[PDB]
Write a protein that binds this ligand. Structure first.
Ligand SMILES: *[C@@H]1O[C@H](CO)[C@@H](O[C@@H]2O[C@H](CO)[C@@H](O[C@@H]3O[C@H](CO[C@H]4O[C@H](CO[C@H]5O[C@H](CO)[C@@H](O)[C@H](O)[C@@H]5O[C@H]5O[C@H](CO)[C@@H](O)[C@H](O)[C@@H]5O)[C@@H](O)[C@H](O[C@@H]5O[C@H](CO)[C@@H](O)[C@H](O)[C@@H]5O)[C@@H]4O)[C@@H](O)[C@H](O[C@@H]4O[C@H](CO)[C@@H](O)[C@H](O)[C@@H]4O)[C@@H]3O)[C@H](O)[C@H]2NC(C)=O)[C@H](O)[C@H]1NC(C)=O
Ligand SMILES: *[C@@H]1O[C@H](CO)[C@@H](O[C@@H]2O[C@H](CO)[C@@H](O[C@@H]3O[C@H](CO[C@@H]4O[C@H](CO)[C@@H](O)[C@H](O)[C@@H]4O)[C@@H](O)[C@H](O[C@H]4O[C@H](CO)[C@@H](O)[C@H](O)[C@@H]4O)[C@@H]3O)[C@H](O)[C@H]2NC(C)=O)[C@H](O)[C@H]1NC(C)=O
Ligand SMILES: *[C@@H]1O[C@H](CO)[C@@H](O[C@@H]2O[C@H](CO)[C@@H](O[C@@H]3O[C@H](CO[C@H]4O[C@H](CO)[C@@H](O)[C@H](O)[C@@H]4O)[C@@H](O)[C@H](O[C@H]4O[C@H](CO)[C@@H](O)[C@H](O)[C@@H]4O)[C@@H]3O)[C@H](O)[C@H]2NC(C)=O)[C@H](O)[C@H]1NC(C)=O
Lengths: 213, 218, 211, 218
């Protein structure tokens, strides 16, 4: 069975750049590819309903190609509208499969995260819950790793991360991580720290605080 | 025995939506009119939906008429019941019942019943958030922290829109409680922490619960 | 169509002959059925076409009536027959049910013995307080529990559970749990449980002072 | 423009079960092969299932094949997806899209999609109980308060089954957290409170949790 080898997994560019992407089928199909855009948390939008075959109502900047095994998508000078994911699809009669989508994004130089750690407010803590927040305020590119340590003990399973998409004035990513603990468990330990690694950092960055200090 | 098994029970919120289903064994459903029934809080039954053979007719009790929708799919032997705009009085056990007899007729009782699945409609249709300061430790970061709300969104601004440079409000996370959390942050000159009083003007727009919180050094 | 069923609770002795009545708001001919339902179980069909006994249903169950008045007779109650029962109008592509009748073993009125339990220190250290009020060995089944904290009527923060009739003494027991975070429990001192029941000439209150 | 409207998605537990559905507007599904797609937290689109025009052929992606069932209703225009015994990696946004074109053919792409619905499969398949004492303040009453356990049931004995007279173990209640709680009590002679030891044996087979708690005066 077919698997799609879409490349790259992320494309970096800017307004007015002409860009090309490529989906390569693991075994040959009869030019049964189509291409979609997807904006974050939205439904995908169909661009090209057969390889090189643009759907009506789609902006004329779009294009593509197909050879029965190797395929392309191309955009003829990106708009600020175009900085979304793009997915290839192979569609058979009663099944389909998609590429791991090419994320199109606004380019800049590498920038390391400014890291900040916030203890729980006393007002939260008296209710019985402690939410410790770690903020990576601005960085580029998107890929970063945050780990929590409580009394130098690497934590696992008690945190939730979300990343804001590219900032409108500098195109950096930002991450925040929330470590959640009942008031009981939080008052059991002293230091609460978050440790960060990223493309711009030569060594991990750790921010910490001592409970009550 | 005739085998029926319901699926898709559990907790729901008022104004919320759910779908029940039932599957079967030891019979094919196509020859039977199929029903849904519930056991309301007084221990009494109510009938909820009936779908005829070949999906010809669908009838409902007045309490659920226009809110719910029954469906069937005989080629895999399944029956479904959509429950849009659930309300607290829909809290009951629900069952998938066969209309039938040892010899089927034009009008019959309900003969074979599944073991049932519970549905609870909790009254928390717009659960208001808990909102908490993230206190500043040349550039400083401060913020506000939202926990335990439903549905989305919780909205945030800094000093009623007087502050916008360096502001970030994060995408919400779904907690293991089934409720949302988020945070809002801003970075500012450290020298201003003494003179400028940062505040976050917030709203859970579904419940229209308007909140404020001053954020200052601890 | 609408239906009414009476009595809502029927108390009887083993071996009795009992009747349960269903009344339709308009004529339904003989288009009515009867169902037996155990606690936690889906209903089982007993009779249809007003009197037609289902294959395998014991002969002690019978039904009669036409138009607007229907009766289910159980001639010699066995211990298995003490259950919920429901009359059910059925039509070609629909149905409707009456309110049901509950059949129980009759005994003398017995007032609940009431006990209140404060939260354990262990649970309280975890941040949650679950007080438990117990109504032990009462009859009949209807009882009302109201929680009051510092004389404040609680609402929406308690859940109840009731046992089935005791096999030896035919009473019921009830437990009510009032749940509060440690943050909300430490705010108020006294925690009371006000019980009313047919066996009590005035409500009974059991209370404790936090700490 | 045309529309699709997914429903039923929310929080779930591993090895638990849920059913999604998709309605439509401005069009009829009776002409179309109907498909389920998902976007996992890893950001890639996965195809999930499809069901042909005329409900003839049902197909699945191999991660959900056998576990899921796709279904349809060509009359009221609804599609369904039963998700029996979900895996943690079944966590995704789940979209419903129609295979389609201005002129249809034996092979077309997905020309309209609904906004998608979130499903989260939390990894805690069973949760073991906490057990707390109900301390005895004639005849006295004491017991144990089993709490926060999933799924049912829990069994309780007293003194390894030697104490049965006077014991009431109550039906569990389902809390608004989605977890169960029950209390087991016993009445005993007040004179025995100093000498006799009372132990409630709480067994939760689904989590393989056993707790023996000694109940004594405060
Ligand atoms: C003598 O010859 C006749 C034909 O002349 C033979 O009859 C045919 O027998 C075939 C083999 O048994 C059947 O093929 C199988 O059918 C199933 C189901 O197919 C359904 O979809 C059909 C197409 O409908 C599409 O496309 C048209 C345009 O072409 C559109 O107008 C339509 O709206 C619809 O479009 C939607 O779906 C498309 C994908 O399907 C999308 O691309 C579109 O965008 C859009 O969403 C449809 O015509 C069929 O009609 C029904 O057929 C039923 C009988 O099969 C019948 O009960 C019913 O009343 C309808 O008439 C179906 O609804 C496919 O899934 C099969 O696919 C194969 O399955 C194999 C595994 O089983 C697999 O290995 C293989 O790779 C394939 O996936 C297969 O195609 C024909 O349906 C059938 N036709 C008729 C008219 O009966 C006859 O059998 C033969 N006899 C002998 C002894 O030789
Ligand atoms: C030739 O064309 C004629 C007319 O178009 C067809 O006659 C119709 O046949 C169909 C199918 O046989 C009939 O539908 C079924 O009728 C059954 C009996 O008739 C009813 O009786 C009740 C009273 O008992 C009346 O109140 C109704 O008005 C009918 O007269 C009926 O029992 C059956 O019920 C359906 O649903 C139940 C739900 O549980 C199923 O259990 C049951 O199996 C069935 O699916 C249908 O309604 C229709 O009534 C006939 N119409 C008439 C009277 O002319 C011929 O069948 C066609 N013959 C050929 C060659 O195909
Ligand atoms: C010959 O071929 C034609 C098509 O070429 C078939 O026509 C279709 O028949 C079906 C079934 O009768 C029709 O479906 C019904 O649609 C009703 C609403 O129709 C109006 O509104 C819709 C948009 O909502 C328009 O598309 C339509 O043009 C109408 O203006 C629904 O309300 C019906 O649902 C009810 O009936 C069913 C079955 O009894 C129940 O299961 C439902 O719960 C509900 O009670 C139903 O879905 C369809 O609209 C027709 N298509 C067209 C284009 O007209 C013929 O049926 C076929 N001949 C035979 C004998 O099969």
């Amino acid at each position: 069975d077919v698997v799609m080898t879409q490349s790259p997994s992320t494309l970096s560019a800017s307004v007015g750049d002409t860009i090309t992407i490529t989906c390569r089928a693991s075994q040959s199909i009869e030019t049964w590819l189509a291409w979609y855009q997807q904006k974050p948390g939205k439904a995908p939008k169909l661009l090209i309903y057969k390889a090189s075959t643009l759907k009506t109502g789609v902006p004329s900047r779009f294009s593509g190609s197909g050879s029965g095994t190797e395929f392309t998508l191309t955009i003829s000078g990106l708009q600020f509208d175009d900085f979304a994911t793009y997915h290839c699809q192979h569609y058979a009669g009663y099944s389909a499969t998609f590429g791991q989508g090419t994320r199109v994004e606004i380019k800049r130089t590498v920038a390391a995260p400014s890291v900040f750690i916030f203890p729980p407010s006393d007002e939260q803590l008296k209710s019985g819950t402690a939410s410790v927040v770690c903020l990576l305020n601005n960085f580029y590119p998107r890929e970063a790793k945050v780990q929590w340590k409580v009394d130098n003990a690497l934590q696992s399973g008690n945190s939730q991360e979300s990343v804001t998409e590219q900032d409108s004035k500098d195109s950096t990513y930002s991450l925040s991580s929330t470590l959640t603990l009942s008031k009981a468990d939080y008052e059991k330990h002293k230091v609460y720290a978050c440790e960060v690694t990223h493309q711009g950092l030569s060594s991990p960055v750790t921010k910490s605080f001592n409970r009550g200090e | 025995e005739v085998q029926l098994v319901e699926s898709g029970g559990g907790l729901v919120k008022a104004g919320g939506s759910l779908i029940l289903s039932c599957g079967v064994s030891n019979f094919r459903i196509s020859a039977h009119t199929m029903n849904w029934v519930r056991r309301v809080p007084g221990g009494g039954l109510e009938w909820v939906a009936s779908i005829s053979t070949s999906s010809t007719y669908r009838d409902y009790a007045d309490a659920v008429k226009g809110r719910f929708t029954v469906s069937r799919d005989d080629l895999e032997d399944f029956v479904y019941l959509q429950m849009h705009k659930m309300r607290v009085e829909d809290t009951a056990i629900y069952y998938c019942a066969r209309k039938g007899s040892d010899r089927l007729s034009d009008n019959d009782p309900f003969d074979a019943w599944g073991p049932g699945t519970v549905v609870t409609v909790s009254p928390a249709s717009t659960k208001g958030p808990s909102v908490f300061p993230l206190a500043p430790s040349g550039t400083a970061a401060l913020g506000c922290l939202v926990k335990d709300y439903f549905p989305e969104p919780v909205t945030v601004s800094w000093n009623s829109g007087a502050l916008t440079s360096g502001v970030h409000t994060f995408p919400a996370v779904l907690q293991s409680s089934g409720l949302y959390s988020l945070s809002s942050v801003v970075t500012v000159p450290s020298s201003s922490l003494g003179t400028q009083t940062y505040i976050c003007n917030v709203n859970h727009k579904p419940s229209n619960t308007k909140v404020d919180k001053k954020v200052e050094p601890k």
